[PDB]
Amino acid sequence: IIGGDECNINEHRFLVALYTSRSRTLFCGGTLINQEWVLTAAHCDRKNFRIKLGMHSKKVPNEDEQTRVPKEKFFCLSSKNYTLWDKDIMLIRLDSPVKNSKHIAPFSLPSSPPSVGSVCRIMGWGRISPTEGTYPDVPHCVNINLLEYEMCRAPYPEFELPATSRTLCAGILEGGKDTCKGDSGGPLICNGQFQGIASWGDDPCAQPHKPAAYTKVFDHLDWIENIIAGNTDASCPP
Ligand SMILES: *[C@@H]1O[C@H](CO)[C@@H](O[C@@H]2O[C@H](CO)[C@@H](O)[C@H](O)[C@H]2NC(C)=O)[C@H](O)[C@H]1NC(C)=O
């Protein structure tokens, strides 16, 4: 996360870290949405990975950290394909439930739709330098604005982005605050609700007028609810 500061140790109880099984290299964030399910991005999928819950500092672990692994992973399509404007979502059922603790608690799915002009917060253990390779020991947090999706189209002519999407466009027009490498898959919290999943942004991060795309959680409520209810034939919004 560029342009923020270390998160308060109590403000990210739902934030989880995806890391490799062997080197313990952190590669994405994610969000605990109840006692046994996590939402992250489809681009975060790996054949083998672990999920750390209740983590703040990497080297000075919270006493109540828990580790889980995916028992099941769900995607919009059997191909697990996604695009720059939709389908970048993965729902994970944990191998066993977690109990709430000082540093662990889920973020409920959103109950209202996101409103343009809201102020949102992002958080993760990604790079805190727009260019370098400075990865923090603790997660950082920063506030950004929810923009009209139309805003995300013009800055990226190479992607020929369609007029509508299943993503939210968020950032700061003047630059300086942004998601960055290692934060993707993590949550975008807007006006108190879990509204986005970090999908992609530009590199270097936090450039002026280069906002980032976050998969729109709200549009996927039916799909999420149906999978959790045990309807595996559920479909993402067309
Ligand atoms: C999922 O996406 C992959 C990669 O974008 C698709 O595989 C490509 O298919 C096209 C032709 O259909 C070829 O040009 C590429 O060589 C393929 N592989 C690549 C780029 O690695 C695939 O079609 C998609 N799967 C679906 C739609 O089921």
Q: Top-level CATH class of 1-10+112-216? A: mainly beta
What are the Cα distances from residue 38, in Å, to 144, 146, 170? 23, 23, 22
Q: How far apart are CA 149 and CA 90, in angstroms?
A: 22
Q: Is the CB of 164 under 6 A from ligand 1?
A: no
Numbered ranges of CATH 2.40.10.10 in the chain = 1-10+112-216, 11-111+217-231
What is the dihedral angle through the alpha carbons of 63, 139, 76, 36, rounded to the nearest 10 degrees?
Answer: 20
Smallest Cα–Cα separation from 130: which of 185, 207, 184, 188? 207
Contact indicator for 195, 216 with CB cutoff of 8 Å = yes
Sheet holding 90-94, edge to edge: 66-68, 50-53, 15-19, 26-32, 37-40, 90-94, 70-74
Q: Is the CB of 23 under 6 A from ligand 1?
A: no
Q: Is the CB of 111 under 6 A from ligand 1?
A: no
Q: Is the CB of 79 under 6 A from ligand 1?
A: yes
Determine the atom of ligand 1 nearest the C-alpha atom of 77.
Answer: 28
Q: How far apart are CA 215 and CA 223, in angstroms?
A: 14
Total length of the chain = 238
DSSP per position, 181-225: TT-TT-EEEETTEEEEEEEE--SSTT-TT--EEEEESGGGHHHHH
What are the residues whose beta carbons fall under 8 Å from the beta carbon of 222, sequence distance 6 or more?
234, 237
Contact indicator for 173, 209 with CB cutoff of 8 Å = yes
Q: Which residues are registered as beta bridge partners of 101?
A: 104
Q: How far apart are CA 194 and CA 120, in angstroms?
A: 9
Smallest Cα–Cα separation from 177: which of 144, 132, 209, 202? 144
Q: How far apart are CA 228 and CA 187, in angstroms?
A: 19
Determine the atom of ligand 1 nearest the C-alpha atom of 78.
Answer: 28
Active site residues: 43, 88, 184
Determine the atom of ligand 1 nearest the C-alpha atom of 79.
Answer: 28
- Burial annotation 76-91 (CB, 10 A radius, 16+ → b, else e): beeeeebebbbbbbbb
What is the dihedral angle through the alpha carbons of 119, 123, 128, 131, rounded to the nearest 10 degrees?
Answer: -70
Between strands 212-216 and 167-171, the pairing is antiparallel
Q: How far is the CA of 80 from the centre of ligand 1 (A)?
A: 11
Q: Is the CB of 232 under 6 A from ligand 1?
A: no
Q: Is the CB of 77 under 6 A from ligand 1?
A: no
Q: How far is the CA of 78 from the centre of ligand 1 (A)?
A: 13
Report the structure determination method: X-ray
Q: How far is the CA of 75 from the centre of ligand 1 (A)?
A: 17
The yes/no answer on whether domain 11-111+217-231 falls in CATH 2.40.10.10 is yes
Q: How far is the CA of 79 from the centre of ligand 1 (A)?
A: 10
> Residue 69: what residue type?
V
Q: How far apart are CA 80 and CA 78, in angstroms?
A: 5
